[PDB]
């Protein structure tokens, strides 16, 4: 009499991932059977590749989740709005599929199974292949993940809903960034460090009263009466060396509120100041999704 989390939320240190974002082309009923088939396929792939430490998540946009749930639960869910009056684009789609493991080849086979399950019921808008770079650094050269929640216990506390109809579920936020590494390389290392709020090589936090309020850490390390607004990030670098490249941002939270407060801060809506990382990288997509618990995917029908 309890709820099970979808396998792709809590895995830490996974080296590769695949994110598929898509729109629903026909009746929403096609998603019910397809989602059951896909979670069945994920269990089959986990049994076939135990050393991959494979996990996956199927999550839904506001319009299709309100239809599938009958308007019950997911009280915070809404279409991703535009932040900073345009600085952050909105590209809200209906379905998000997040696959992560220690083996990219296994993720590829799982992605093909997801596409076969949903079939022509969906219109794929985006497919991004994430990879962990050297020393878990973002392509800018700064380590990404240091203050991210560590261990299954704290990650569950931050990302997984505790009780009620949505017990075992989570809110998802995805946003693809395009880095301009030529513009980053024009900045001196000390100026890049003041932009992030941590040192580049050693990955040491620069004190809050020593760094600009526009620094990344000053924008996203938010507290409400001393209580941190934490999120579980699963972001990874992506792209080609000669073409488009950057960071595919992905975060899970039991409360959509924590993610929104950080976006309001980063894009100038809270105090009129914006994130200093906008000097070299920009967001080009944006969407909010609800990841139900495993058994609520089984009760779709």
Q: Could you tell me the CA-to-CA distances from 70 to 49, 63, 66, 73, 122 in Å, in that order?
A: 36, 11, 6, 9, 21
Considering only residues 262, 267, 289, 296, which one is a binding residue for ligand HEM as defined by CB under 6 A?
262
CB 159 → ligand HEM: shortest distance, Å? 13
Q: Is the Cβ of residue 70 or residue 188 nearer to ligand HEM in the bound state?
A: 188
**Cα–Cα dist 176/87, whole Å:** 13
Phi, psi of 122 (to 5 degrees): -120, 155
**Cα–Cα dist 7/53, whole Å:** 10
Q: Which stretch binds ligand HEM (CB under 6 A): 4-12, 29-37, 107-115, 258-266?
A: 258-266
Q: Check residue 217 for interaction with ligand HEM (CB under 6 A).
A: yes
* Angle, alpha carbons 7-9-13 (nearest 5°): 100
Name 247's bridge partners: 177, 237
Q: Which stretch binds ligand HEM (CB under 6 A): 45-53, 67-75, 144-152, 287-295?
A: 144-152
Q: Is the Cβ of residue 26 or residue 151 nearer to Mg ion in the bound state?
A: 151
SS3 124: strand
Considering only residues 19, 65, 93, 142, which one is a binding residue for ligand HEM as defined by CB under 6 A?
142
Q: Could you tell me the end-to-end alpha-carbon distance of the chain, in angstroms, rounded to an integer?
A: 20
Considering only residues 56, 58, 247, 256, which one is a binding residue for ligand HEM as defined by CB under 6 A?
247
Considering only residues 155, 198, 274, 296, which one is a binding residue for ligand HEM as defined by CB under 6 A?
198
- Residue 225 annotated as binding site: yes
Q: Could you tell me the CA-to-CA distances from 44 to 114, 248, 284 in Å, in that order?
A: 13, 27, 35
CB 4 → ligand HEM: shortest distance, Å? 27
Q: How far is CA 145 from the centre of its chain?
A: 13
* Angle, alpha carbons 190-191-192 (nearest 5°): 90
Q: Are 56 and 98 in contact (CB under 8 A)?
A: yes
CB 244 → ligand HEM: shortest distance, Å? 13
Q: Check residue 236 for interaction with ligand HEM (CB under 6 A).
A: no
User: Catalytic residue among 138, 144, 166, 275, which?
Assistant: 144
- 275 assigned to active site: no
Phi, psi of 248 (to 5 degrees): -90, 105
Q: Is the Cβ of residue 218 or residue 293 nearer to ligand HEM in the bound state?
A: 218
CB 198 → Mg ion: shortest distance, Å? 10
Phi, psi of 255 (to 5 degrees): -125, 125
Considering only residues 221, 222, 273, 279, which one is a binding residue for Mg ion as defined by CB under 5 A?
221
Name the residue among 45, 20, 43 with its Cα closest to residue 115.
20
Instruction: Report the binding-site residues for Mg(2+).
Output: 221, 225
Contact residues for ligand HEM, defined by CB under 6 A? 138, 140, 142-148, 175, 177, 196, 198, 216-217, 220-221, 231, 247, 249, 259, 262-263, 277, 281
Q: Which residues are catalytic, by number?
A: 144
Residues that bind Mg ion (CB under 5 A): 221
């Amino acid at each position: 009499g309890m709820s099970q989390v979808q396998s792709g939320i809590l895995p830490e240190h996974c080296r590769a991932a695949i994110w598929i974002e898509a729109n629903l082309k026909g009746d929403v009923n096609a998603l019910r059977e397809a989602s059951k088939i896909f979670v069945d396929n994920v269990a089959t792939f986990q049994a076939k590749f135990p050393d991959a430490k494979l996990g996956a998540v199927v999550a839904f946009g506001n319009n299709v989740w309100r239809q599938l749930s009958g308007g019950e639960g997911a009280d915070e869910l809404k279409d991703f709005p535009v932040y900073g009056k345009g600085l952050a684009p909105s590209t809200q789609y209906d379905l998000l599929i997040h696959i992560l493991s220690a083996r990219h080849e296994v993720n590829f086979s799982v992605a093909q199974a997801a596409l076969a399950a949903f079939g022509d019921a969906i219109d794929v808008k985006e497919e991004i292949h994430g990879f962990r770079w050297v020393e878990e650094r973002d392509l800018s050269g700064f380590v990404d993940g240091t203050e991210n929640p560590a261990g299954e216990e704290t990650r569950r506390e931050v990302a997984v809903i505790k009780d009620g109809v949505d017990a075992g579920g989570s809110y998802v936020f995805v946003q693809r960034w395009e880095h301009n590494l030529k513009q980053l390389n024009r900045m001196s290392v000390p100026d890049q460090e003041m932009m992030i709020g941590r040192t580049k090589d050693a990955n040491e936090e620069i004190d809050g009263d020593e760094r600009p309020v526009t620094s990344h850490l000053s924008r996203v390390d938010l507290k409400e009466d001393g209580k941190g607004l934490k999120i579980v990030r699963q972001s990874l670098p992506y792209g080609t060396a000669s073409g488009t490249h950057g960071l595919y941002f992905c975060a899970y939270c039991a409360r959509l509120y924590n993610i929104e407060q950080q976006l309001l801060s980063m894009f100038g809506d809270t105090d009129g100041k914006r994130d200093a990382m906008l000097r070299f990288t920009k967001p080009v997509t944006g969407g909010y999704y609800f990841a139900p618990s495993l058994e609520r995917i089984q009760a779709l029908g």
